Paper text:
Class I RNRs are composed of two proteins, a large α-subunit (R1) and a smaller β-subunit (R2) that exist as homodimers, that combine to form an active heterotetramer. [name] is a hyperthermophilic bacterium with an unusual RNR encoding a 346-residue intein in the DNA sequence encoding its R2 subunit.
Autocatalytic splicing of the intein in AaR2_genomic generates a peptide bond between Leu229 and Cys230, which thereby brings Glu228 and His231 into position to serve as ligands for the dinuclear metal site. In contrast, the di-iron site of the AaR2_genomic structure showed electron density consistent with the presence of two iron atoms, termed Fe1 and Fe2. The two irons are coordinated by four carboxylates (Asp97, Glu127, Glu194, and Glu228) and two histidines (His130 and His231). A higher occupancy is observed for Fe1 compared to that of Fe2. Fe1 was modeled with an occupancy of 0.8 and is positioned by residues Glu127, Glu194, Glu228, and His231, in addition to an ordered water molecule, whereas Fe2 was modeled with an occupancy of 0.25 and is coordinated by Asp97, Glu127, His130, and Glu228. The distance between the two iron atoms is 3.8 Å. The phenolic oxygen of the presumed radical harboring tyrosine (Tyr134) is positioned 3.1 Å from Asp97 and is 4.7 Å from the nearest iron atom.
Numbering used by the authors:
A (entry chain A), B (entry chain A): 7 to 327
Write the structure that this text describes.
């Protein structure tokens, strides 16, 4: 089931916005934005593109360079490096992969939303370069960008995230599309969140609160990104039920469980109970709470039915802007 | 010469920013933005992404709906429709094609700049939908989006712009890459500029000055877009001289001349000497002046050596924000 990439202009395209599909539609590829079939796509474009606009270099980085230099434990510095190294990798993969999704989507408003998302991932990449230029020395910043070259746990996370995307790239069929889409949702649902919790920990004890400002903006973006793919997956289920074979529906629950498992083993490798305010048990229930939250939001039963409340419920108010 | 699309993560990638190439480089595809080989790419990202940020819906559209309703000649309304219809088509093609360029570029800072450009093209698409929702009735706005369905001159412009891009899409080789790149530069250099001159005409007689506000923002964006591809083409010439065969170098001067010719035949079909302040002769020298300006900026002799001054030199000060 080989998804063609639409031609640049289709004079035999449907005039009728009502006939749009997320995939395999018959558009003109003119952005006929006087009629919107997916109001969520256009609302999310306006939210990411205009409402939540932000400039990383307008966040003051006056203090963090000192707190790093003298006030951070050797464990806090290790975490800082690992977390920032991995988030740099994630946002790099996303800038690139979202171009693959956008060029396959046949609904203009959804392509618009994906373009805005791609742009926000580029802003994140700008934010990390600004965080490091401000906070650390030049060889150290190079080392953090390159830390996968020294840390096999980090290298293996990266190769694994790339694996799911490269199957679709190399073999661009409907199956490999749904799995990439699910992989995107998992990556935005889960893989930021050991990282975010750790920064909001450092920050609730008044450490690296400049870095934490940057992180709050990134995390606002990532909730919009999660919402966008939630809608794409749930609309894809309605519009293309053939694609959610029982094999696929099973795999979705396998990967979501694996993914929850790994984010926890990273959360714990990063921290190692050496970070005041977070331990290996709190981590486990955060990621399992997030897993159920996100797999149910896309039409599945909880995967960790024991967990029902959010261990870190304080983050919801801290992370607000 | 078949340009592979880089894999999502390359652990065998060069660590050394100095070794980046615009195409056919060997990157990790981690955005290692602590070292920038192409300062112009990163400066242009910051300029498009942060400095020149703008929100179309924050431009007041109080007057234009009335001026359209009563004050615009039947010829002024025809132009308005044709110009806006064609710019909607251009910006649609660009949002989509820039995803093709970004996924082929191996220098992260240039991919960043292309992402920002893609995002600005989406903002333009938002601007046109806002211009029409404000200025005209719902069936008329649909008609303007769809005007290629009624006007064979407009349909043929569209199919022609798509042709150059689809060769690269269908046959993604080095030759078809350079021609697409040149086509992008021509489209941003020329194909906006009958349209821009016409709006700044309407606007120097105090007609549709709200539309003209929107247009000034779009035209600031398009000058950054022209600069970006100027640099890409001139860097591609240094880095890949094999690709600028004499066949190619000849074709570049053919298409640039054709393209100047067509933009004039559109400029004249749109207006028809029925627009106070612009005639078929002024058009001819504007587009020929722009042609030399842009083909020389990418290492060629003037193509209209008779023309040396800019007929509409007043636009440079009018269009400023
Ligand atoms: Fe991000
Ligand atoms: Fe994201
Ligand atoms: Fe545009
Ligand atoms: Fe443009």
């Amino acid at each position: 089931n080989e998804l063609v990439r639409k031609l640049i202009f289709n004079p035999q395209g449907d005039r009728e916005a009502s006939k749009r599909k997320i995939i395999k539609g018959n558009p003109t590829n003119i952005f006929e934005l006087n009629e919107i079939k997916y109001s969520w796509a256009f609302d999310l474009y306006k939210l990411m593109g205009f409402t939540n606009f932000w400039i990383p270099e307008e966040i003051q980085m006056l203090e963090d360079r000192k707190q790093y230099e003298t006030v951070l434990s050797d464990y806090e510095k290790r975490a800082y490096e690992l977390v920032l190294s991995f988030l740099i990798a994630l946002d790099s993969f996303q800038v690139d992969m979202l171009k693959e999704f956008g060029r396959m989507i046949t609904a203009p408003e959804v392509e618009m939303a994906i373009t805005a998302q791609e742009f926000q991932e580029s802003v994140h990449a700008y934010s990390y370069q600004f965080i490091l230029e401000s906070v650390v020395d030049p060889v150290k910043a190079d080392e953090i960008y390159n830390y996968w070259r020294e840390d096999e746990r980090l290298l293996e996370r990266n190769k694994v995230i790339a694996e799911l995307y490269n199957e679709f790239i190399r073999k661009p069929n409907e199956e490999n599309f749904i799995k990439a889409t699910i992989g995107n949702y998992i990556l935005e649902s889960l893989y930021f969140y050991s990282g975010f919790a750790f920064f909001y920990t450092l920050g609730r004890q008044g450490k690296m609160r400049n870095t934490v400002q940057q992180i709050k903006y990134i995390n606002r973006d990532e909730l919009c990104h999660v919402t966008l793919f939630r809608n794409i997956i749930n609309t894809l289920r309605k519009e293309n039920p053939e694609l959610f074979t029982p094999e696929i529906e099973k795999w979705i629950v396998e990967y979501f469980k694996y993914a929850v498992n790994e984010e926890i083993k990273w959360g714990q490798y990063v921290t190692q109970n050496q970070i005041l305010g977070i331990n290996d048990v709190l981590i486990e229930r955060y990621i399992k709470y997030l897993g159920n939250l996100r797999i149910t939001q896309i039409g599945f039963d909880p995967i960790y039915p024991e967990v029902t409340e959010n261990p870190l419920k304080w983050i919801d108010e801290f992370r607000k802007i």
